């Protein structure tokens with residue numbers, strides 16, 4: 461088959477999807493798309509995903525987006541292990557519920573530090589301290605609900621075994637981390653779950669799945685950051701503009 | 705069975721879920737939860753849904769949340785018509801992709817007018833003009849991507865026939881409307897799809913599904929609005945606080 465997977469490993473959902481595929485070893489044609497540069501706006505990329513977003517999966521002439529769908533379609537088409545995306549009514553619901561809450565409270569809330577720290581200043585824009593504080597206190601606020609509301613005493617957000625819910629979560633939460641935010645500091649229930657997930661998944665994977673963002677603060681300083689194209693500049697300006 | 709459905713028809717997801725169930729006629733014990741009042745924070749409600757959010761479905765001793773999950777679990781358990789939540793790979797993905805994008809760009813963006821106009825002032829807080837403008841220009845921006853990116857020339861966001869994607873969408877979009885925003889004004893592609901969905905669903909349903917929010921601006925003025933409990937106050941304070 462060789463369905464192409466256009467992503468940028470600096471993008472948390474992009475990561476999550478890339479860990480699933482490989483970990484469940486799926487033939488994929490990893491087509492890098494430089495977000496920071498603005499490749500995801502190149503007229504040529506827009507002929508594949510009108511929205512100009514990452515990651516987008518091109519299977520056949522069927523171009524799908526949103527990691528949630530991508531992963532699930534992946535899991536389905538590629539009959540991956542059941543524990544991943546269960547078939548049990550109660551089961552699946554628990555993932556669909558998290559992925560529903562994840563996109564509300566986690567998504568867009570745990571990637572702000574990069575804009576405050578790297579992307580923002582990349583285009584001369586400085587984010588307001590208040591928004592910075594407000595966002596961080598907004599983070600743990602999520603981390604708690606994620607800590608005791610979903611995780612609880614069980615081993616996983618979505619239940620008993622690893623699930624896309626955990627792949628999404630842990631990836632999203634890896635950004636503030638790689639930036640210098642140790643969110644698992646005062647959270648053993650959290651530090652453990654993550655490490656539990658990591659354990660299962662494997663070092664070599666996680667050790668390369670991240671990398672890009674782990675070094676990100678460096679290239680930043682060493683100004684190894686590409687200058688965003690006007691199209692990217694816009695979206696960078698919009699994003700920073702919806703920081704509450 | 706008689707699984708209970710705790711909701712408030714002033715809450716868009718609450719509506720969407722309530723339209724599916726009845727329209728596909730499912731035994732439901734509609735347990736009203738006054739959001740504006742703060743019943744969704746009553747210690748008693750919290751013993752049902754720790755998060756204190758609406759809607760939450762109590763089937764058996766299995767308490768599920770997030771309309772997405774609820775609806776899907778509903779559809780499944782209640783083997784509802786296929787067109788709803790397809791079984792076709794390509795098919796389902798298209799819903800899973802929209803509901804993925806819906807939660808990003810539509811959810812949280814199309815309910816701000818109510819806070820700017822009713823709920824905000826309810827507790828003496830006034831939202832800044834900028835946030836107001838910013839949000840509206842942020843709406844159509846969504847309306848366009850929804851208009852031509854998902855809808856396109858086809859009859860539905862998620863494909864050819866009505867689907868939870870359309871139930872969710874149109875409901876979310878009904879709030880700005882009921883408040884005085886005619887989002888289908890300069891949008892025939894949009895005005896039509898909505899009316900097409902409406903057609904299918906039925907007046908009597910939609911004529912009662914909404915109502916609550918349609919009258920909402922009046923009770924507002926005639927001060928028929930209950931005074932929020934301290935717990936509600938907080939949440940309204942937080943919400944208004946994440947208005948970009």
Ligand SMILES: N[C@@H](CCC(=O)N[C@@H](CSCc1cccc2ccccc12)C(=O)NCC(=O)O)C(=O)O
Nearest residue numbers: 470471472473495496512513514515526527695804
């Ligand atoms: N719900 C879908 C949304 C994907 C998404 O928002 N993708 C973001 C990128 S992740 C975030 C991200 C990481 C690293 C560098 C970046 C530089 C510029 C902008 C975002 C960056 C996107 O496409 N953004 C482009 C856009 O929205 O225009 C999903 O989960 O996949």
Ligand SMILES: N[C@@H](CCC(=O)N[C@@H](CSCc1cccc2ccccc12)C(=O)NCC(=O)O)C(=O)O
Nearest residue numbers: 560714715716717739740756757758759770771939
């Ligand atoms: N992804 C899930 C989230 C549901 C949700 O956010 N529900 C909101 C209510 S909708 C929005 C809404 C409409 C009318 C009056 C309201 C008064 C106070 C707060 C919100 C109001 C909620 O539970 N909010 C409570 C909370 O988050 O604490 C879904 O789609 O169902």
